[PDB]
Design a protein around this ligand. Sequence first.
Ligand code: FAD
Ligand code: FAD
Lengths: 379, 364
Amino acid sequence: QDLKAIVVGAGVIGSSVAYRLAQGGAQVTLVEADRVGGGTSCVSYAWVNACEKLTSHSYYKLNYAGRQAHEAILDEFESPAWYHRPGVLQWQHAEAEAGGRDDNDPLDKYRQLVEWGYPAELIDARDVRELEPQINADAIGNAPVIHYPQDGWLDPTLYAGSLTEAAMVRHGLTLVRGKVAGLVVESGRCTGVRLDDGSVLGADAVINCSGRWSNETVGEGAPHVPLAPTVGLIAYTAPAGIGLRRALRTPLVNMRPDGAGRLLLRSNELDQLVGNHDAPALDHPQALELLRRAEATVPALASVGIEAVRIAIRPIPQDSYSAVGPVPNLGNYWVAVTHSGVTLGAFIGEALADEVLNGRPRPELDDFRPARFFEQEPA
Amino acid sequence: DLKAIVVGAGVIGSSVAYRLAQGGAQVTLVEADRVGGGTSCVSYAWVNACEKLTSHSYYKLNYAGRQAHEAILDEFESPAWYHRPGVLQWQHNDPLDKYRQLVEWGYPAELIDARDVRELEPQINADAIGNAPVIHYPQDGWLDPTLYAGSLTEAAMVRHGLTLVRGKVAGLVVESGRCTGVRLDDGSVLGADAVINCSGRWSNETVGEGAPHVPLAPTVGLIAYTAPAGIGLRRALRTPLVNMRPDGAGRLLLRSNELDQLVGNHDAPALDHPQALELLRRAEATVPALASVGIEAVRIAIRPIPQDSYSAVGPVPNLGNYWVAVTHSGVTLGAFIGEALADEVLNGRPRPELDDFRPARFFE
Ligand SMILES: Cc1cc2nc3c(=O)[nH]c(=O)nc-3n(C[C@H](O)[C@H](O)[C@H](O)COP(=O)(O)OP(=O)(O)OC[C@H]3O[C@@H](n4cnc5c(N)ncnc54)[C@H](O)[C@@H]3O)c2cc1C
Ligand SMILES: Cc1cc2nc3c(=O)[nH]c(=O)nc-3n(C[C@H](O)[C@H](O)[C@H](O)COP(=O)(O)OP(=O)(O)OC[C@H]3O[C@@H](n4cnc5c(N)ncnc54)[C@H](O)[C@@H]3O)c2cc1C
């Protein structure tokens, strides 16, 4: 009786899809070529947010539903330690994780945030140090800073590991360490996956959650979602003897606590100087510059060094927006590939579980289906 | 107003400086490297009163340290440095004897078995436990001592005017048998009414040739830190093969007393250090879901003394206005030592809980 579902990829998205499918009664096989949470989800600022999406109201609403889903799922776990919400401070001219530099006036931006219901407040530049006194007074500038007091970041690898553990223990999910090389397709319907050893894993549904590898996973077996990948480098300090509670997104650097005093540092500007295949050396020129910018922002960081550097590729559909759903003329197959995948992961899990188990697409995804990239009329 | 110099900005010095500044002293905190950058940065940091049980007096001191770490949280906004998901502990002296002693003294501990662990942490390999009894400390956890030290130092500066000096103390300034300040390695002098040496394993090196020394028996410790791991583990584990616990965003901290015996004092903390690689293997044997997770960091530190009974926390007899703090369970005791030594310096009231740690006991 039970529907057999294969989820390819165990990142923040695939772990969510697999967990909700298994909870929904499906017999789930999660196929992961590397390790649970070891892909781009391991190299992310991971701000769970809708406030970076003020141009598309429907994309804002999708990201807001993702944010709400991350709060709701915590109730299903014991002592979940993966969603830290101490607040986020965002400057005018800050770079966005979703892309670009935001030069809009903070008061105009705040009016829109209020109208769209996002929890936020403004802080005068001269009052920022009341919240975080170790910020350099010379680094703050003169414009108001947006404070998202209930916002924070995910630990996507810990999240993915916890959901996979629960899916296995509570709902009989199986984890397969293997690399999908293509799909098995019979009469226009996908009937399973083929691994790179030629072995076949049969299923009633296949959900491709392989991130920036989305098209390489299916090869010639499925239509491709056009992608526009970019590289990201993140530097992680040794544990730092500073008091910083909140995430900081200044015109110079994006930085935040990442556990036990460690700091995560990144910059869109510096990403442009990183090659796709650069070695993540601890003395990488952009990692060293990230540390310099962090110390200029918080001078109390003196003598704290870089302990880790990670590099990954962003899954980004060609038009910037999520692609979650079926593709033309291939039954029993779904794909999920998107930027802001941390924000959206939990919601994508419940949305695709509803589609696979009950044939019920969520209305929030209406503007974000893969079909928009293909022919709209019969050829 | 009393002028106090605290040397060393680890978990102990930051606590002493914080409570002294809170108490009205003008505090100068002198740190040669960085706040929280010493042994406090390389610690399992279990806040506990159950390791290496000896006397009820030693338990009461460690328990007061544990309670002080909970109480201090109320003085800070959203403190993120004390994680209490529970601790699980099993061996291959006797664990029942230890469990019974802890229950009799009132410590929150429970005796469970491998089937109970399967419910709490299902990704632990049952083979790693066997039929051994398991002690669960359900309200216990660990500190982030570097984040703690940085937060207390920030608060002391903002709220109470503490000054932080990046400098290396080379000796004490003494006038007619009384300490009147410190001398830095550039020859400059910082004067004060009281000096509290909280330089950890560097305690004797800090004061140099013209000041008293306390006994030390140093040993080396290595800790390996994994990249973020896709496992669900909530609790800290203390097992026969490895002590391992979450350390942030999925990272795991790994260490072992047995493997520490094979580490040299000046070993480079290489990511492929032979004992770091063996720690990773033992961690995967304990939690097989750790497959393909690698080592991301390795840190090495020196412990000044191997057991709590070697500790020297209090005034030093042959020199006035001078205190020292050398501990074994420095994370557990840090907050309490802060309030205890602040009380001595400000009010001349030595806490009786520190009586067994008096440095004067080493001088006849
Ligand atoms: C620097 C940076 C900062 C970011 N900041 C944010 C932020 O603040 N907020 C936000 O919401 N998003 C942010 N993101 C985006 C977010 O991190 C990603 O969108 C998200 O992690 C993608 O998740 P995923 O599960 O789709 O991909 P992944 O985590 O990469 O998971 C895909 C998995 O598929 C596996 N796989 C691949 N090919 C195969 C195969 N053939 N067979 C089997 N398994 C396979 C891989 O091993 C991998 O584990 C950021 C991204 C970057 C790079
Ligand atoms: C592997 C390991 C595991 C541990 N696990 C636990 C545990 O589970 N529970 C527990 O309670 N404890 C534990 N401990 C013990 C605990 O970590 C230490 O006792 C504690 O961190 C010591 O703090 P401290 O402030 O005294 O020393 P430190 O943190 O070393 O601080 C001393 C400071 O003095 C500075 N300094 C040195 N010389 C000078 C100078 N001349 N001038 C100025 N500054 C100077 C140094 O730079 C340093 O920052 C563990 C220790 C180790 C090594």
